[PDB]
């Protein structure tokens, strides 16, 4: 995250780190949606242009973390993957449409002060909150700028941007399964995700029921925090049919 700040303890207890075993590194962000299911961006796991093709056994899920690099004994919980499910119409070739994947954990994770699932929106939540100007929150352990790495989990709040403005910022084809967020050049505030933040959550706090909802998945940007560019997020509600289907089936 660029131009964000250190997370408070327990602020984002659904944040998950995808951690590569060999070599030991940050692969991506993700989020906890129940005691056995973790949501992330497809391209964190599968992306042929960068020769990314991770199998279950290549990765661990680390939950309840705050520090980027420390083993947070008896705070974080580390889980093994049972199975990865990538959206079958994930479009890596063109625009990262349907940049979404699920992971089932081998065993259920115990909830705690530091570990707690985020809510998934329903149609009405999306209609209410996913409006230009409305701010959400993006969290992660990715880089502090485009070209270094934080000691602890980083947060930034960012406004959803008008669809035409998103489109006019990029040469890439933007779909209805994506939204964009970030400040405009004039605004006097800035901030973005950056390398290592992909797959993490864009969350909003419902003012109707005081619960946090994951409205987006960190997907892509042209660089990080550049004037005139925005972040593109997977629209969770639009892919919820798919989410429900994977979880109902498996």
């Amino acid at each position: 995250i660029v131009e964000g700040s250190d997370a408070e303890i327990g602020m984002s207890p659904w944040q998950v780190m995808l951690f590569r075993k060999s070599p030991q590194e940050l692969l991506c962000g993700a989020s906890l949606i129940s005691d056995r299911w973790v949501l992330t961006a497809a391209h964190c796991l599968l992306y042929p242009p960068w020769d990314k093709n991770f199998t279950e056994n290549d990765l661990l899920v680390r939950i309840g973390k705050h520090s980027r690099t420390r083993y947070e004994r008896n705070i974080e919980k580390i889980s093994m993957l049972e199975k990865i499910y990538i959206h079958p119409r994930y479009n890596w070739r063109e625009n990262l449409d349907r940049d979404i994947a699920l992971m089932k954990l081998k065993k259920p994770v115990a909830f705690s002060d530091y570990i707690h699932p985020v809510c998934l929106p329903d149609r009405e939540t999306a209609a209410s909150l996913l409006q230009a100007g409305y701010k959400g929150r993006v969290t992660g352990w990715g880089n502090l700028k485009e070209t270094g790495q934080p000691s602890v989990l980083q947060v930034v709040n960012l406004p959803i941007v008008e669809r035409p403005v998103c489109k006019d910022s990029t040469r890439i084809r933007i779909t209805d399964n994506m939204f964009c967020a970030g400040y405009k050049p004039d605004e006097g505030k800035r901030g973005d995700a950056c390398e290592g933040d992909s797959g993490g959550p864009f969350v909003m706090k419902s003012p109707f029921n005081n619960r946090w909802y994951q409205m987006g998945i960190v997907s892509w940007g042209e660089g990080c925090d550049r004037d005139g560019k925005y972040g593109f997020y997977t629209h969770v509600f639009r892919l919820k049919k798919w989410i429900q289907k994977v979880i109902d089936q498996f």
């Binding site: 951690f19 075993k21 070599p23 030991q24 590194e25 661990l60 690099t69 420390r70 083993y71 093994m80």
Partner: peptide
């Protein structure tokens, strides 16, 4: 490794 070693059980 920038990362602290994880217990052996997880690997």
């Amino acid at each position: 490794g920038d990362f602290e070693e994880i217990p052996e059980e997880y690997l």
